[PDB]
Amino acid sequence: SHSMRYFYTSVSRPGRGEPRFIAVGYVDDTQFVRFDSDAASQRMEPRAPWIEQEGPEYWDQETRNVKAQSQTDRVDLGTLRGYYNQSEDGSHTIQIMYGCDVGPDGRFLRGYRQDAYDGKDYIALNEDLRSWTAADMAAQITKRKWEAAHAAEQQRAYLEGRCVEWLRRYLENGKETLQRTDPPKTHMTHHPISDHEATLRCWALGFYPAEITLTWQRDGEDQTQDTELVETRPAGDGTFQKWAAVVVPSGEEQRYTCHVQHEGLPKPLTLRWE
Amino acid sequence: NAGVTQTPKFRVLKTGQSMTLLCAQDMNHEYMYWYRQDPGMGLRLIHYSVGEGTTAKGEVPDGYNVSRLKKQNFLLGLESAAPSQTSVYFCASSYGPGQHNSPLHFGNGTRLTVTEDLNKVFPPEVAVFEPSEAEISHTQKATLVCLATGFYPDHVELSWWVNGKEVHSGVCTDPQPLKEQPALNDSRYALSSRLRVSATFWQDPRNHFRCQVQFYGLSENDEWTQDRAKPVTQIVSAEAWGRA
Amino acid sequence: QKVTQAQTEISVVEKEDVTLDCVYETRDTTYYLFWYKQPPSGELVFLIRRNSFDEQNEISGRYSWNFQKSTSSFNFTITASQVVDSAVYFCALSGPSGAGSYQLTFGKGTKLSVIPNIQNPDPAVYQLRDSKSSDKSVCLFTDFDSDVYITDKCVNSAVAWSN
């Protein structure tokens, strides 16, 4: 299985003219394109090795289309400010997430299209890609005119069509980076917190994709009391890292064993302090 | 909502004179355009504007300039008028980024002529012609023919008035005014129209038929020192009563 | 970005079918196609818009539009020609500009001339005397030298005069 996603962000700057627009594209957990309305290049720019090979007609099309959207978002900030009867002098954020998924067979699984106003659900295209779901009355207005215009047919055309066409292309073009699973480089560190206690911290470094499961076991049995996971943080080199810590009584370190599960690993790992 | 209004309907100019074409839309549209239609060419964009304040050069901007003062109004300026600029001009508007798939809404178009000399500007000589006895006898219908000759520019509106009220039923006016001298570029034009009514209606002498030609020529501000009458925007007419 | 309407002028018999060809040419992936009608009067009348994605065929009364994405054409056919269909028809293509604002380029236009079929062919020429001075007069042809002028037939009658 694989996935493609684009994330548009549009924020109003009342007093400092034109709203700022930012767009970024991901294949699985790998960013490959970006556009910024404030950036002087005024062009969609590459953010991965395997997209740089695309010709200038690609970069002009992407630029022209993603700029056209920013101009719509700019008017839609006005529209929604009207709908909700909000202050003229208020920064507001229209985020748009859309993209498609392909199975192991390389065939379409499902598509997404979701809009949010000030970081709360506004309107979402349903899984059948022929019907919408509004979050409040303002979005119910948008829903109606989008039903009347048959806007859903546009989104479906992309998600079932040119989304999967170009997702397949990317997953091939850069298969060496995108289909490559880097397994986690694991170790365990000891931190005495008193003369009758200690903190065992189970590390996992430089793994792709970010999907991972760290779990503590005491004498074979699952142990989550005093466990403390942290959000899967990016290494900033394409790879990810995450550690799970547990507080143990002094001189019982052997009993506690950390278990790492990752797509990159054929068999799940088992660690233990010495 | 009215849509895209635009003025004037017609206008003549001396080579070098100035004028401003006026257009306004009440549909709160972001985009507004100024097109140029000519025989052989398509709709060629002179200047456009993607929102209040800003404008931009189109395909054929040379000899023109535009003012997007407020949203509603998009102006088209001719500083020095050239014979080239003799064309039909359409104002247009599109909703804007809010509706990308919006079509162009067009105005009812301005017809501009730009002559070297204004002494080539003549009003029409209108004359109504009584229907044929042969026609009445053969068809039991009577076809009045009206004829305007030797007018320039080709800027006329022909109307039929039966007993003081305008008629549309049974009228056929030529769509194109024809050149009396096709060979010449400053050729004076001629337009014809027919009014088909029942023989009963023609042969009744209480029925008064009048052909009316609204001619769009010079304004009063245009200087005129020629021996004949000044060819200003007037209404030349010709009438005929019924008869048995 | 380019739009070509192959035919300059196309005349047709009344109540015969006629297809107004429009071949377009763009690198744009999301675009919108338009047809406009301009009757002799002069106004530009919006007929239909086609989205780049939607299905090829659509039937709206006597009007019908075939949208062949693969041949990159959008042909407009009028079945059973009415005389009122006589007009200049325009084909246009809207795509995003460098600014991120959809502007559209038009074809040069196709002129349709729907000649009425002569179901009752009794051509007659009538002479009409001037309302005022009878010396000047005019001729009128029904049901069908530079000093002599003849008007284009309108609907069916043409006017002929000489000084």
Binding site: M44, N65, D76, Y98, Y122, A151 | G98, H100, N101 | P96
Partner: peptide, 10 residues
């Protein structure tokens, strides 16, 4: 690639 700019906006 990106989806074409929304025809009718919110």
């Amino acid at each position: 690639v990106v989806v074409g700019a929304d025809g009718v906006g919110k």
